[PDB]
């Protein structure tokens, strides 16, 4: 069992930090998201009944993005993975990844971030 | 048995899509098929009869994105799943990757779509 | 507990390598940091006293490559490995690696390195 | 256990190939080769003597990419992976990934290939 | 007088198009705008009314993509000309670059697009 | 009358080139484009009956390409630029590139190919 | 004489900008160099005390932009521009462009920035 | 006549560079040569005798990198210029283009070289 949905590169603007000038300047939010799906049926027959709508994921995840400022990724992400998971009964697992290739972090690096992963129960 | 043979990037200019703008202006397609196959005895010998012409996997797959439109990316990947899974009982495991990085979608993003992985019956 | 906290193309240029001429002459490390960490809790509140600052990661695995030069990037790895490991025991495990795009090596490839994963102890 | 040697990105010009015209012309072949070793001890020590050298092992995969001509990628994957696992009994698993880019496939694709995992015994 | 101020990789998504299929879905559509000011002044005293905030630049070319609907780039390329060659006596020219990287054409390519240069009178 | 409209790396996969073999493999062959057309009045009215629609000039390159082979990159340049010329009394001049990024040829590039420029008679 | 000794990319992570805010977070700016300096017997020799060594132009671009704060590029490309008019009489005209990839602007794009170009007196 | 004959992306592997550190190491170096020829016969005719072998040009500028150690990007480009400029009455000019990604300077760039123009007599 390894099908899996998948929205990746999703960029958002955010002014998500910890900081007081992050919460303010906001900066573009990279958002990764699988979700452990099983596309046999869908595959099967065709249908939407048989699987979730990357459309409707994407605004989920729009939601929580671009939604109120929160301080660590881990709560966008948390609040990405428990708004696929309780929405979808159809998705077991839901990974989340954030990125921020914009931190206030003097230096040089392709980005900095987090990663969940949550199951449904 | 972890080895594999692969063909990723495969664009194609299909008509597919649920919407009716979709099929009927059409989008570039981005297929990624993986195909799981023991490969110790075509590197022992070194035949094509030993392992799988990934060229002939591209016309399979080929055959299915520039082939009858239709709703899901599922389907096309169910498509491709399948036609490539009969034709070659070689192939233990199949993994088809669709993407749409230009899907009707208000919203900046490098690419959507869905995953599955098949095996042989 | 499959979530992490990754850091990924941290650039630094440091005199380190084998040969004499590199940390002669120097070349650029690109640092990729993954730590395994729950991030559930963090998420769940939102306060970084329930994460590890990212940020801060960076400086602790910068002052390792504008640090000390030294022979093998396994050691760069493990002297990163460690610092970060210590410093922090929510950090169940973590994943240092280097790439030198650069070496002296006569030949045409992308880049070239090596990884570790360590846990925490 | 998870530490990886890694070559990413090699790519050289081989005449391999399972039609004559290829066998004649030639094309740039990429190569990706990830070596399950434990940089534990070397992480430890900082010494040559606790790992592989990654430019012996570049060597390696060197001689056999340009060397004679072959029809698939098995064997010329299946022929770097028992010639690093029989050089090295310090690597446990030796991958090889090769892709063609430029295979007499017509058609839009970022490249066809295979994807060897060997251990060691 | 070679100086510019620039907007280079300016993506909006619209719904502009003389075809009524992409006027329903839309597209991701890609601007470059490069102005032709003095920033002599700028830059010794760096004071900002010494020169043109690209930021409020950029606001008159998202009003104009982010906007109704329109048949040509030309126009969208249009209205971007003077609503800044109007706006600020800073400029002596406008350049602006429209590009439409997935057109409704059946294809493999870059992408296609059109390019004004007006200044100001 | 600096205007343009460009047509960027339209990818063909033809069996054109100077080797017999190449004619039986295949390769990509991309392709820039950029015809100078008048777009005074094209802006002003927004009919593209006052321009070059490009999607038309794609598939006028595409016959080119998709025909017939040949061994100079040149005669299919011409074929494409003489294909134009003959079509439109918009284009003041046209301007054909075909890069080659994949020629029977032992080395590293990003590719050769020539390029011509061609006005109306 | 068209020659010039180029520094493309210098990316300094910088606490300048119009915004208090930016001068707490930092970012890289990513700085073009063009110096036009005749390069007739700085080949004929191979003396480069016959031309401009840009590691010195480098490091004291450097200097620069890893100094304290400003507002704008522009004093920054002055700061720079001045620093090279005033040290090398081989420079007969110099060319600096500041690029902003991550300056506080509610939008996507490749970035924004300003270039000058100023020769000796 | 803006016809062009091109090699962008050279990259060779050669001991140049003014400090005998960097004649230890070596470095990749890549040149772009892009020649001025009359591609018109050619195109019509279509006789390689009508124009240019690039495949000959990427010969000369091979041997020159590839052959022995140097001290300037000048001078490496010196007998690339004349190399083609006296084997082919063909071209007019040879405008050559070398670029240093990884120097021995510290910093974070893109890369840097020198382009020089020269023609024939
Ligand atoms: N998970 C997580 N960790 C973080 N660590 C540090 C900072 C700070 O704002 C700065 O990046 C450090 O300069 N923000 C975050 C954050 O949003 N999420
Ligand atoms: N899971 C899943 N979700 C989808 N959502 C929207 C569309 C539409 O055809 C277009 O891509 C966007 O308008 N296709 C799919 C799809 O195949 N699979
Ligand atoms: N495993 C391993 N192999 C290596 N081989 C060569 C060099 C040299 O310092 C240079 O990169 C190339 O000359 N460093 C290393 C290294 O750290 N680890
Ligand atoms: N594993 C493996 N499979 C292959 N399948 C087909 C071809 C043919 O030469 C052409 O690519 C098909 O056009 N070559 C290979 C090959 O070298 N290796
Ligand atoms: N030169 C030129 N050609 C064009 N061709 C088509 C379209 C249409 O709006 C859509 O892109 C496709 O029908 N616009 C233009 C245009 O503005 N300029
Ligand atoms: N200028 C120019 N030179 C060329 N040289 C070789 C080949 C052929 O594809 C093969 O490399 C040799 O058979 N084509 C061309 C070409 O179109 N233009
Ligand atoms: N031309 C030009 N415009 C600018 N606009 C805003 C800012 C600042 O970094 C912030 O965006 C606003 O505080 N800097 C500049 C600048 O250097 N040059
Ligand atoms: N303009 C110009 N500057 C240069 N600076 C340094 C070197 C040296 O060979 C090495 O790159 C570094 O010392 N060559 C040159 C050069 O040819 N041209």
Same mark, same amino acid.
Do not use: C, W
């Given at each position: 069992?390894?099908?899996?949905?998948?929205?990746?590169?999703?960029?958002?603007?955010?002014? &998500?930090? #910890?900081?007081?000038?992050? @919460?303010? *300047?906001?900066?573009?939010?990279?958002?990764?998201?699988?979700? $452990? %799906?099983?596309?046999?049926?869908?595959?099967?027959?065709?249908?939407?009944?048989?699987?979730?709508?990357?459309?409707?994921?994407?605004?989920?995840?729009?939601?929580?993005?671009?939604?109120?400022?929160?301080?660590?990724?881990? &709560?966008? #992400?948390?609040?990405?993975? @428990?708004? *696929?998971?309780?929405?979808?009964?159809?998705?077991?697992?839901? $990974? %989340?990844?954030?990125?921020?290739?914009?931190?206030?972090?003097?230096?040089?690096?392709?980005?900095?971030?987090?990663?969940?992963?949550?199951?449904?129960?």
């Amino acid at each position: 069992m390894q099908d899996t949905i998948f929205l990746k590169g999703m960029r958002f603007y955010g002014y &998500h930090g #910890a900081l007081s000038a992050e @919460n303010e *300047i906001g900066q573009i939010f990279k958002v990764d998201v699988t979700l $452990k %799906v099983d596309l046999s049926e869908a595959g099967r027959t065709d249908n939407v009944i048989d699987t979730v709508h990357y459309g409707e994921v994407f605004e989920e995840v729009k939601s929580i993005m671009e939604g109120k400022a929160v301080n660590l990724l881990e &709560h966008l #992400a948390e609040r990405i993975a @428990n708004r *696929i998971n309780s929405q979808y009964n159809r998705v077991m697992e839901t $990974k %989340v990844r954030i990125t921020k290739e914009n931190p206030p972090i003097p230096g040089h690096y392709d980005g900095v971030g987090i990663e969940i992963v949550r199951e449904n129960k």
